[PDB]
């Protein structure tokens, strides 16, 4: 008989199976559609989730109760040191899909990128690309590479650059670089190859891929939770306390007929560590990395036009379980998938941004830098000393010194 009262189903069947992701790095399942009219440009970038703080900004939203009023908005800090282009890959449109036509790598490959090719770098001889690189010097190789570039020019319709992160600039134990293919949109295919050939072995900053006030998508692997019951995995109603045999369950996993458990019924298993693609994450700030100017170190990337404090995006005491953000970063509104230190794929929007929220221009007024390793009380090292004054350790240090 019919269920007495109507109720929505628990969970979405569009995210099945709820299995551990086959990949750790976020995968761009679809790149933005190519408009040859647009200038040649990359469509994606790789970043690392450092942590989250909150900001203060004035909202220009006519007709809203927060119009010309200041609000506090949580933001996520994604460390994005420049990526190095080490290869070009061409694709041909076939009646069976897109087929990898030809791959051409640059002459010089860093040990960061070369680590990606080895399960045990320590025990290896690091021979990868040692014979390939000679093609760029030998006369026979130079002609062969030029044949590849011309064939890619003549037959490929999709051109992508193979780029890798610089793990040496990040405060992580990992030194193996995450490599990914980034599609090159805009222009003709000939212009795509000319543009990509120049960028070979070069660095690409994040501000050449993304801009301020841009709605972008974040692709990555959610935080793993291990083996979970239906109550946590699918958020099914807990059974009464009197329930024998346990209550963190689903009572009826199906009718008598059909005589099989259906795929739509909530079951226990893996939760988290699922590949996901969240969209419309607005870029609030593209921060600059630490810079050395005429002898001194410039690190006031957390200063706004209204808070001229010389402080970095790093909270007092550093980002918890991540480290110190010294490279370029992107400040994204709201939260994103993944743990701290998780590599995130930043992709341009597949949609046309015309809503007022998407077209909003963000002007920051304050960036919170209080410690997140407890109840943060002071924005900077300086004002903590100014407020508290000298301590016992300070007296002893000045006593020992003089």
């Amino acid at each position: 008989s019919h269920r007495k009262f109507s109720a929505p189903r628990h969970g979405s069947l569009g995210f099945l199976p709820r299995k551990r992701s086959s990949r750790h790095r976020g995968k761009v399942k679809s790149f933005p559609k190519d408009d040859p009219s647009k200038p040649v440009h990359l469509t994606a970038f790789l970043g690392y989730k450092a942590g989250m703080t909150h900001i203060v900004r004035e909202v220009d939203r006519p007709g809203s109760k927060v119009n010309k009023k200041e609000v506090v908005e949580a933001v996520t800090i994604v460390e994005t040191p420049p990526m190095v282009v080490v290869g070009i890959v061409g694709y041909v449109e076939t009646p069976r899909g897109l087929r990898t036509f030809k791959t051409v790598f640059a002459e010089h490959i860093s040990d960061e990128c070369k680590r990606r090719f080895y399960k045990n770098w320590h025990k290896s001889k690091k021979k990868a690309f040692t014979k390939y690189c000679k093609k760029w010097q030998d006369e026979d190789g130079k002609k062969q590479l030029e044949k590849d570039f011309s064939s890619m020019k003549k037959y490929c319709q999709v051109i992508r650059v193979i780029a890798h992160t610089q793990m040496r600039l990040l405060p992580l134990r990992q030194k193996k670089a995450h490599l990914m293919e980034i599609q090159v949109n805009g222009g003709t295919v000939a212009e795509k190859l000319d543009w990509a050939r120049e960028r070979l072995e070069q660095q690409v900053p994040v501000n050449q891929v993304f801009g301020q006030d841009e709605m972008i998508d974040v692709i990555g692997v959610t935080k793993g939770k291990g083996y979970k019951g239906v109550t946590s995995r699918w958020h099914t109603k807990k059974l009464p306390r009197k329930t024998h045999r346990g209550l963190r369950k689903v009572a009826c996993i199906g009718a008598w007929h059909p005589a099989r458990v259906a795929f739509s019924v909530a079951r226990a298993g893996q939760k988290g560590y699922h590949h996901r693609t969240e969209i419309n994450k607005k870029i609030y700030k593209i921060g600059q990395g630490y810079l050395i100017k005429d002898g001194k170190l410039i690190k006031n990337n957390a200063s706004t036009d209204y808070d001229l404090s010389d402080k970095s995006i790093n909270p007092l005491g550093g980002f918890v379980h991540y480290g110190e953000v010294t490279n370029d970063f992107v400040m994204l509104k709201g939260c994103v998938v993944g743990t701290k230190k998780r590599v995130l794929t930043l992709r341009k929007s597949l949609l046309v941004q015309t809503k007022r929220r998407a077209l909003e221009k963000i002007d920051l007024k304050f960036i919170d830098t209080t410690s997140k390793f407890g109840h943060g009380r002071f924005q900077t090292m300086e004002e903590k000393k100014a407020f508290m004054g000298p301590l016992k350790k300070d007296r002893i240090a000045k006593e020992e010194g003089a």
Partner: protein, 140 residues
Amino acid sequence: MSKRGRGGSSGAKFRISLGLPVGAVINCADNTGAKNLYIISVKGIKGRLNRLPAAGVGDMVMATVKKGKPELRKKVHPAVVIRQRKSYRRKDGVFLYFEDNAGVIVNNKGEMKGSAITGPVAKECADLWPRIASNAGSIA
């Protein structure tokens, strides 16, 4: 936006944590002679299976007077929550909460049955109901 009548505001109330589910007995903060309001239903709630309708400041509810003047008892009144003890986040990041849960008896037009309000009235409630804000002593 549960409020359903002409005379509303271009700006719309943002979502607030609701701490007062049906069954909540809240104080009556006006001079009608009622001492408390017993919620029986929140206006605008569609809800789901098993979820008790719940209200926050600014929410019109239907309530019965459990103790107070006898002619106010044994009948259903439209009431508006003006104070709640559940802390709720404003858009400027302030987690505000009051000492008590309080309401005032009104009619369907939003006009207030009493004449004075004891204690402060939340800013969210005051903006949504002009008549209540008019009788308020302080707006928190």
